[PDB]
Amino acid sequence: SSHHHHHHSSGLVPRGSHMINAKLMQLVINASNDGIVVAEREGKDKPLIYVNPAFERLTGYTLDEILYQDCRFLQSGDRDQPALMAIRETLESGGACREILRNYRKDGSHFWNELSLSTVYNEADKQTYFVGVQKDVTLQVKAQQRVGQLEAELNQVKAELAALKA
């Protein structure tokens, strides 16, 4: 049994249009606990055109150091990171991904950054934009690193035990 309302639902009107009229989305995204950023295309680069204060606190870098350049500067030259190829493929082909990179704050310290990215085509101006949600996942990556070394060491002991038996 059910009591559903029998209305048609349209996709012609952008979802959450009341948030536009009340400027509510700008307010709450500026307040988010996660780093949130928006980029546009410019040749071989994807310069940032929006970042929120959580992203500045995350990176320690200032807004003018961040805005209007490609996010790759956070790699601080650590350009030999494997996740980069997966990120390029998503952003060039369209779609969504969640990928972890090493990044460096303004004060030199490092951290594990998890990039949750997607592309969105804008019918108005015919441009593709990109949106990213970022956060420090250092503790979670260290745990995953711990499982991997624990299994490599479990197999050494197991194999040495199996050999001494046989």
Ligand X SMILES: Cc1cc2nc3c(=O)[nH]c(=O)nc-3n(C[C@H](O)[C@H](O)[C@H](O)COP(=O)(O)O)c2cc1C
> Rounded to whole angstroms, how far apart are CA atoms 101 and 113?
5
Cβ neighbours around 75 below 10 Å, total: 17
Map the footprint of ligand X across residues 43-62, applying CB under 6 A.
46
Neighbours of 41 (CB within 10 A): 14
Work out whether 13 is an interface residue with a second copy (CB under 8 A).
no
User: Which of 63, 32, 60 has its CA nearest to residue 49?
Assistant: 63
Q: With CB cut-offs between 5 and 8 Å by kind, which of ligand X, Na ion, a second copy, none does residue 19 bind?
A: a second copy
Q: Does 135 bind ligand X (CB under 6 A)?
A: no
Considering only residues 106 through 165, tell me which ones interact with Na ion, judged by CB under 5 A: 114, 116, 133, 135
Site for a second copy in 118-137 (CB under 8 A): 118-120, 122, 124-125, 129-131, 133, 135
> Radius of gyration over alpha carbons of the chain, in Å?
22
Give the integer Cα–Cα distance in Å for 127 and 41: 8
Among 6, 23, 79, 126, binds a second copy (CB under 8 A): 23
- d(C-alpha 120, C-alpha 98), whole Å: 16
Task: Give dist(CA 2, CA 97) in Å, integer.
Answer: 37
Which residue of 46, 52, 59, 74 would you call a contact of a second copy, by CB under 8 A? 52
- 153 near a second copy, judged by CB under 8 A: yes
Residues within the interface to a second copy (CB under 8 A): 5, 9, 14-20, 22-34, 38, 49-53, 63-64, 67, 96-98, 116-120, 122, 124-125, 129-131, 133, 135, 140, 143-144, 146-147, 150-151, 153-154, 157-158, 160-161, 164-165
